[PDB]
Design an enzyme around this catalytic site. Structure first.
Site, PDB file in Angstrom:
ATOM      1  N   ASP A   1      15.674  11.592  -8.085  1.00  0.00           N
ATOM      2  CA  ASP A   1      17.072  12.010  -8.123  1.00  0.00           C
ATOM      3  C   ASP A   1      17.809  11.741  -6.820  1.00  0.00           C
ATOM      4  OD1 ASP A   1      17.213  12.763 -10.747  1.00  0.00           O
ATOM      5  OD2 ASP A   1      16.963  14.911 -10.377  1.00  0.00           O
TER       6      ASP A   1
ATOM      7  N   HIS B 276       0.803  -1.214   0.000  1.00  0.00           N
ATOM      8  CA  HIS B 276       0.000   0.000   0.000  1.00  0.00           C
ATOM      9  C   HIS B 276       0.841   1.271   0.000  1.00  0.00           C
ATOM     10  CE1 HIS B 276      -4.454   0.762   0.724  1.00  0.00           C
ATOM     11  NE2 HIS B 276      -3.962   1.969   0.508  1.00  0.00           N
TER      12      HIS B 276
ATOM     13  N   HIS C 119      -9.737  10.574  -0.104  1.00  0.00           N
ATOM     14  CA  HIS C 119      -8.614   9.667   0.084  1.00  0.00           C
ATOM     15  C   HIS C 119      -7.579  10.193   1.068  1.00  0.00           C
ATOM     16  CE1 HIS C 119      -7.868   5.790  -1.694  1.00  0.00           C
ATOM     17  NE2 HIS C 119      -6.573   6.026  -1.801  1.00  0.00           N
TER      18      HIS C 119
ATOM     19  N   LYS D 229       2.839   4.453  -1.090  1.00  0.00           N
ATOM     20  CA  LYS D 229       2.758   5.363  -2.234  1.00  0.00           C
ATOM     21  C   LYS D 229       3.732   6.509  -1.984  1.00  0.00           C
ATOM     22  CE  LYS D 229      -2.080   4.237  -1.838  1.00  0.00           C
ATOM     23  NZ  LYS D 229      -3.227   4.585  -0.959  1.00  0.00           N
TER      24      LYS D 229
END
Ligand SMILES: *[C@@H]1O[C@H](CO)[C@@H](O[C@@H]2O[C@H](CO)[C@@H](O)[C@H](O)[C@H]2NC(C)=O)[C@H](O)[C@H]1NC(C)=O
Ligand SMILES: *[C@@H]1O[C@H](CO)[C@@H](O[C@@H]2O[C@H](CO)[C@@H](O)[C@H](O)[C@H]2NC(C)=O)[C@H](O)[C@H]1NC(C)=O
Ligand SMILES: *[C@@H]1O[C@H](CO)[C@@H](O[C@@H]2O[C@H](CO)[C@@H](O)[C@H](O)[C@H]2NC(C)=O)[C@H](O)[C@H]1NC(C)=O
Ligand SMILES: *[C@@H]1O[C@H](CO)[C@@H](O[C@@H]2O[C@H](CO)[C@@H](O)[C@H](O)[C@H]2NC(C)=O)[C@H](O)[C@H]1NC(C)=O
Ligand SMILES: *[C@@H]1O[C@H](CO)[C@@H](O[C@@H]2O[C@H](CO)[C@@H](O)[C@H](O)[C@H]2NC(C)=O)[C@H](O)[C@H]1NC(C)=O
Ligand SMILES: *[C@@H]1O[C@H](CO)[C@@H](O[C@@H]2O[C@H](CO)[C@@H](O)[C@H](O)[C@H]2NC(C)=O)[C@H](O)[C@H]1NC(C)=O
Ligand SMILES: *[C@@H]1O[C@H](CO)[C@@H](O[C@@H]2O[C@H](CO)[C@@H](O)[C@H](O)[C@H]2NC(C)=O)[C@H](O)[C@H]1NC(C)=O
Ligand SMILES: *[C@@H]1O[C@H](CO)[C@@H](O)[C@H](O)[C@H]1NC(C)=O
Ligand SMILES: *[C@@H]1O[C@H](CO)[C@@H](O)[C@H](O)[C@H]1NC(C)=O
Ligand SMILES: *[C@@H]1O[C@H](CO)[C@@H](O)[C@H](O)[C@H]1NC(C)=O
Ligand SMILES: *[C@@H]1O[C@H](CO)[C@@H](O)[C@H](O)[C@H]1NC(C)=O
Ligand SMILES: *[C@@H]1O[C@H](CO)[C@@H](O)[C@H](O)[C@H]1NC(C)=O
Ligand SMILES: *[C@@H]1O[C@H](CO)[C@@H](O)[C@H](O)[C@H]1NC(C)=O
Ligand SMILES: *[C@@H]1O[C@H](CO)[C@@H](O)[C@H](O)[C@H]1NC(C)=O
Ligand SMILES: *[C@@H]1O[C@H](CO)[C@@H](O)[C@H](O)[C@H]1NC(C)=O
Ligand SMILES: *[C@@H]1O[C@H](CO)[C@@H](O)[C@H](O)[C@H]1NC(C)=O
Ligand SMILES: *[C@@H]1O[C@H](CO)[C@@H](O)[C@H](O)[C@H]1NC(C)=O
Ligand SMILES: *[C@@H]1O[C@H](CO)[C@@H](O)[C@H](O)[C@H]1NC(C)=O
Ligand SMILES: *[C@@H]1O[C@H](CO)[C@@H](O)[C@H](O)[C@H]1NC(C)=O
Ligand SMILES: *[C@@H]1O[C@H](CO)[C@@H](O)[C@H](O)[C@H]1NC(C)=O
Ligand SMILES: *[C@@H]1O[C@H](CO)[C@@H](O)[C@H](O)[C@H]1NC(C)=O
Lengths: 414, 414, 414, 414
Positions: free
Chosen positions: C129, C122, C336, C124
């Protein structure tokens, strides 16, 4: 333009071997530091015994002591701020230096360290002009200049580290207010911007350097300040070649808290390193007329860990300072250096190695790591510390645990 | 009703001092257990070497092992269930007794302890008919019955403890299914009723007694079960007068993992007890022609804490067994006892005192506490264990660490 | 030179009140982050649904996803390394974007979290860089950009924290090797530097800031890393004035494991804080068409503790999002945002509040504390998060638990 | 030949529906117990107010208490040893019954529970002749006989249970010696022989019966004594059909402590049972004019979990005792019953459900399980307790949490 120079005090009538490494004398460094002061001087000390009559002895070895005291007085005569933080359960209770300085104009606060955490304020450091600092094991005493072997670090023109140390001094100062209590969370003024994982990067005389300060006890550690115990553990555990350490007194027990308890952390960290990583561990301790004879069995056990056939190499020696004529002065002629040096870092501490020093007694310490730079001639700080340690070991004043020949001036078996 | 009688095996040609205390012979107890068996026999063992030819040595001392195997076959001939759990990386590679028993109609499972937790099934207990239970440091081996010196415990007629150890054996058994994995949680059917906090209560021959069982590793420890490390630490800490321990090996480090690391838990517990609580600590270790000589430095380190002035007293002695004419029999003539005796408890276990025996290697430990009952004749199990330990300690075969002499049987460094 | 800017996305057809606080749009931040990339892009995602046709519905709202995919392909054109970690049980099976990037030269790896810990990946976050990071609840999907309310944090020029997150990304990457198992202990490579005890000190745009990350499950948490549940509990306990939390799903029970159990840890922490410390507690919960109606009993139970007289104030509101003419889009039109803000710290996480998210699935969190700087500057991150929470709370789309209007959108009683 | 009899006391002006089950009156059982005793009587009580003038109220409902006091004096006349243990901070302070009994010749020892554990001696039980016992929620007060609804248990002709309760009372008496402290480990006799895993089996009136005692706080729990919190948790967890409970007060907090803390152990157990096991949970909390109005939010929070769709039933009601003409009598007209009913066991306690009663305040509890016997004529104790609970629940005196009619003589909102 930070400058770091090692400083140590060689006791009277303690000749070293010919061609031995050495650093700057402590008295000269302190006098120069006080001369260069122009704004304010902040000092935290365990006790003050600058003049000989404070103790009650009549000796010519206190000349540096009253020279320092008169230098302090003449500095106060130039309208320079001066703050002193000292432990409420002080050691030399007959001294009058603090009263004289307070009458001259200085501000002195007695930190009630014995009531807050049932300990003492063992920290000994200076913050001069907010730019120059001193850190070491020496105390404000003529014996520490002429009778007790010392070892410290003095930094010049390093404002960031100076303010970092000034934060701890300010914690000590605000704790010195009458009827004060431990704040649950320290305000966002004493938080340190440099710690173990974010050291202060700088160019010390064109040499890369990473440095940070450690504080104890945990009750007096603000947010972002690495504790002394974790700094010691990190220095020991990051070792890959050797661990050279020297303390005045070391045993894995609690001293001044009843009932006594085992405190095996620093010992376990030593044995674990020496066994798992195969690092040559060398330990030096101070033996004197005031040494507790019960310390020796722990050292003998650590020595018994040694096993050359299994790549386990632990060696323990004691340091004997010949009293000679200096028998009237009390609590002197002792190796009071407290530090260790690794092939990577170099730790210069103030507290001893016991449970109280890391749980109840206030302390402070600094860690430096000077990687080689653009000057091949220059020598890093860890190399100098290792050279001093090897000079101490190779000296005839260091006797192994087995060697208990008559004539040594310490209790030994007791 | 529960009965509890200690059982130990005295090796051939190893006489003891006159008037020394003794216990029930191991072979007689095993034969009694097999004779009393009527429903089922559940055996958890490390390896099986019952017959002399299994090893490959032609000696008359294996006659008792042959008799034991004959009795086992006779039991199998009376339609008596026999379930055996053995470690997958066994030791007597060339053994054939297990195959014979399987052909006779016994169920044998090779527990894949090697591929599960990188360990072995060192647990050596015994459950008969779900009522009679044996447990001790004696493998199913003829030399373990007539050549090696161990000490175990058998409990008669008392069903609840037998059910608890049957639960442990059932965990071992369900782990023996081919292509089985370690469960993340254990079902309620595997849950020990008795632990450190709630030990079993019983009246052993009119004498009050409390007992419980411990298991290892934590991976094979269901809810309610006490870890071996936890039980050992509790037994060490609770003691306030003395701690007597006998083990074959005492390594404060890991033995088979890579890289090796220090594991000071047991050493720290022993030192903390002996220092803080003023507990007299005596340690006895076994010697054999095949023994790691690197164990001795740690024993010497533990012995070094022997300052009688400060109420700390630790003594360490090794226990050798003369080889005599039994040089042909391999891995014998050694002390296999593994127990701890205090003034309020008596730990009897099957695991050594290294890190792997409590981290990866499976094992089982029993802690039994007895108190003086209404009857004034008998003595508590702690008293008998202490008397046996003192008999071993005062025996001519036990010598000090500095007692190295010609004619000994230890490796003795080198 | 770290710069922390709060980022969020507002769905179309969702107007806010005039003068309401607002943050940087998510699409602009993502595009700028992709443009600034010149060395490598590391992204850990739950699923990939960048293109509209991948789901199977054509809409003008997928233009942002098309532009993002085009940018990613252009980055792949300029020899930019791109490593992708995705859970083995993906959500959107019809996803050809991953195949497109793999053909273009990506390094997509499927982490078998389903087989290892019976969970999903889950997490995210981005690591661009090795200096810039993005943390939030927005998995890469055009629905998140256009049709789902979102909130996250992006940090620029903070390479140390970027390495700290790259440690967790490397853990996920190593776990993605085919035929791999969970190591018993993680190597020293993955050991973290900053935890709740020693956060990362930094001057973010002239404002002091302390930050650190979290990881889950504890099986995947290496040494020195604070657990997500532990960090959440610490943040809840430390708060002394208020606790504002906004999550999609809040279940005090196990959500997927069979048989279901009760996990009151977060509920107990919230109740204990609100009762003992008298802290105002506000809970905002997103309520879409896919929400389970069994949610509401627990929310009502938490709300029932509201007792203004006894200094126990707890309020719970439900934030619905209008559907309108966007019904053809599945798994969209929800809130969300998963974060909690207190008066001393701000937590932004990527996982809901259930037992599985902290014991079985993989998620990361970010705890940021900013102190009022010497300069007036603007407002701390905590203040901005509090303002956003207040704006959401006062919005017409937020309703009470008892205010089930007939013309609403969520399931409500089902 | 043990016989177990359930005893309850219906107060005046409290009728019941036709056909309602009932048990023996408490006063009759107490009088029969006092008459039967011929060797010794041991009692433990919170306070002693056996006459109307003790409180200072003249009413015809004190005749029973005066008769009981006269019976006690008559028993003292026949030279029967009578020992009393009472809490030092007793509730009733103007009473003189203890002084009268001491003058008669009975030994009375004060238990300084308020100094040792900062609690009170809430235990209420009798031990007559060491063969018959009584345990219930009734104090030595005429209100408990006439003005308070109460429930208790009386055991006849049972030697072992009487001995166990004698051990508990002996711990209470030993604590009562002037200038005494908590023993570190209780002596051998104080250890108990029956716990939750080894209950006392017996043929109670011809049917099988397993029972054991429980004690609190842990400071007063000898070896082998099951903590009453553990007993409550066990009887809650072992439930598979229903959990019927009835307590005077229910706070998942700490009532008398500083600072107050949330204590969710019992709440967590109830919720976990109701959710995971799907057990119909019912509560019956007593209400009166002295009831704290801050408890109701917790009851509302507990009841809000009710969800017939998802198989959760946590229905909660409150019991109201009408005041009528008895407004003069203080601390009366309340439901003081404390018991738990289950299809397996039936817990009877003497304490409310708060952290104080399981941490500091002393108390006892009896757990009885009665398996159905060969003869179905004798209803088991669990069935009788369930019938009594159902009679109380279906009675008009029980009101739901939503019912707040003005004529209900309760605090409700305050
Ligand atoms: C710290 O910095 C100050 C200023 O940069 C140094 O003071 C100078 O020292 C040089 C060297 O002797 C003199 O020539 C200058 O006249 C000094 N200037 C001032 C304003 O004092 C100082 O020496 C530095 N500290 C150390 C220990 O070298
Ligand atoms: C003690 O350390 C030495 C030094 O490493 C070991 O000697 C060899 O060291 C090399 C270093 O490259 C290794 O590759 C060898 O495996 C080491 N052993 C031998 C036999 O050559 C020495 O083995 C160590 N002692 C023990 C007991 O391991
Ligand atoms: C277990 O208990 C049984 C009976 O309860 C014991 O059997 C008796 O043993 C004694 C002494 O050996 C004999 O005198 C009796 O004749 C036996 N009776 C029966 C019915 O067997 C048995 O010995 C006990 N177990 C052990 C190991 O002693
Ligand atoms: C790095 O990027 C360059 C383009 O900027 C890639 O260059 C092309 O490479 C292919 C072969 O892979 C040649 O046929 C083209 O002519 C090249 N275009 C040029 C030189 O402008 C280069 O291949 C990339 N690096 C890789 C993938 O190794
Ligand atoms: C991160 O650091 C880079 C430099 O490494 C910053 O880029 C500079 O930003 C300033 C202010 O916007 C410009 O004036 C310079 O021209 C930029 N230089 C380069 C080489 O781009 C950047 O702004 C910093 N912050 C980010 C990327 O958010
Ligand atoms: C709720 O909290 C407030 C403060 O947090 C309490 O107010 C205090 O009340 C006491 C006694 O009433 C006073 O001595 C203090 O001076 C008050 N402090 C402040 C800041 O007002 C209030 O009493 C609490 N409410 C309850 C029901 O306990
Ligand atoms: C709630 O409980 C009911 C029982 O009243 C469950 O209904 C089940 O239906 C299946 C279908 O054949 C059967 O197993 C039984 O009739 C019922 N099961 C049990 C255990 O009684 C219903 O499934 C439950 N709902 C849940 C658990 O979500
Ligand atoms: C200290 O000793 C010197 C040298 O003998 C002497 O001159 C001086 O008077 C002494 N001072 C005191 C205070 O005794
Ligand atoms: C210090 O200040 C006093 C007045 O406060 C002044 O008289 C004196 O001259 C000052 N001396 C110096 C050295 O500044
Ligand atoms: C912290 O320092 C600032 C100046 O830097 C000062 O204004 C403030 O009063 C200090 N805080 C406290 C609590 O003393
Ligand atoms: C110590 O005393 C001896 C013996 O008188 C003398 O030779 C030596 O010089 C003294 N040391 C000093 C004064 O430092
Ligand atoms: C073993 O030894 C005996 C005599 O010691 C001999 O009779 C027998 O044949 C031997 N057996 C083997 C297998 O060596
Ligand atoms: C025991 O086993 C044998 C062999 O299988 C069988 O013949 C016999 O019937 C069984 N039962 C007995 C001997 O009671
Ligand atoms: C307990 O349950 C396990 C689960 O399958 C089973 O293997 C075992 O036989 C059971 N034990 C019993 C029923 O005694
Ligand atoms: C500890 O030792 C001291 C003297 O070394 C002795 O007086 C004391 O009795 C000892 N402690 C005990 C408990 O015997
Ligand atoms: C070993 O053999 C010799 C000679 O055969 C014998 O005297 C001695 O007793 C034997 N030792 C043992 C232990 O049997
Ligand atoms: C989606 O866009 C339009 C609907 O407005 C439709 O005509 C078109 O064919 C669709 N595109 C695809 C690829 O299905
Ligand atoms: C592990 O550490 C080594 C040395 O620091 C490094 O070369 C290697 O890339 C690291 N591997 C991983 C997976 O982090
Ligand atoms: C949905 O309807 C609104 C007005 O009802 C309109 O503004 C919007 O453009 C519509 N959505 C799309 C995707 O066209
Ligand atoms: C009040 O008390 C007196 C005794 O002091 C008693 O005689 C009288 O009956 C009481 N009144 C009642 C019970 O109404
Ligand atoms: C109780 O003891 C007294 C002691 O003087 C005696 O007079 C009386 O008769 C005794 N009562 C009995 C034994 O019932």
């Amino acid at each position: 333009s930070c400058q770091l120079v090692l400083v140590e005090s060689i006791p009277q009538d303690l000749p070293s071997a010919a061609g031995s490494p050495s650093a700057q004398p402590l008295g000269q460094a302190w006098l120069q530091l006080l001369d260069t002061a122009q704004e304010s001087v902040h000092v935290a000390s365990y006790y003050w015994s600058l003049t000989g009559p404070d103790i009650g002895v009549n000796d010519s070895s206190s000349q540096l002591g009253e020279a320092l005291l008169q230098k302090l007085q003449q500095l106060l005569g130039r309208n320079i701020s001066l703050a002193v933080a000292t432990s409420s359960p002080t050691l030399a209770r007959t001294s009058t230096d603090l009263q004289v300085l307070a009458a001259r104009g200085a501000h002195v606060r007695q930190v009630p360290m014995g009531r807050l955490t049932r300990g003492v304020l063992h920290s000994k450091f200076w913050v001069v002009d907010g730019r120059h600092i001193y850190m070491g094991s020496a105390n404000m005493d003529w014996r520490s200049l002429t009778q007790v072997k010392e070892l410290g670090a003095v930094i010049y023109n390093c404002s960031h580290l100076a303010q970092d140390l000034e934060k701890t001094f300010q914690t000590y100062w605000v704790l010195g207010v009458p009827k004060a209590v431990l704040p649950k969370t320290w305000p966002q003024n004493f938080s340190s911007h440099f710690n173990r994982f974010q050291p202060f990067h700088g160019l010390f005389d064109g040499v890369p350097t990473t440095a940070y300060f450690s504080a104890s006890p945990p009750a007096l550690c603000p947010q972002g300040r690495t504790r002394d115990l974790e700094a010691l553990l990190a220095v020991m555990g990051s070792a890959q070649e050797f661990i050279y350490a020297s303390v005045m007194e070391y045993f894995p027990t609690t001293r001044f808290s009843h009932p006594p308890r085992y405190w095996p952390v620093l010992d376990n960290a030593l044995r674990a390193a020496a066994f798992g990583k195969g690092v040559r561990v060398r330990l030096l301790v101070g033996c004197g007329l005031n040494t507790d004879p019960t310390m020796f069995p722990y050292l003998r056990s650590l020595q018994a860990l040694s096993n050359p056939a299994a790549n386990v190499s632990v060696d323990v020696k004691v340091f004997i300072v010949p009293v000679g004529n200096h028998s009237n002065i009390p609590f002197s002629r002792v190796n009071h250096s407290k530090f260790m040096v690794t092939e990577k870092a170099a730790y210069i501490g103030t507290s001893n190695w016991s449970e109280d020093y890391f749980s109840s007694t206030a302390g402070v310490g600094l860690v430096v790591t000077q990687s080689p730079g653009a000057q091949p001639a220059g020598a890093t700080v860890q190399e100098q510390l290792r050279q001093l340690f090897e000079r101490d070991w190779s000296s005839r004043y260091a006797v192994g645990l087995d060697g208990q020949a008559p004539g040594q001036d310490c209790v030994w078996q007791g």
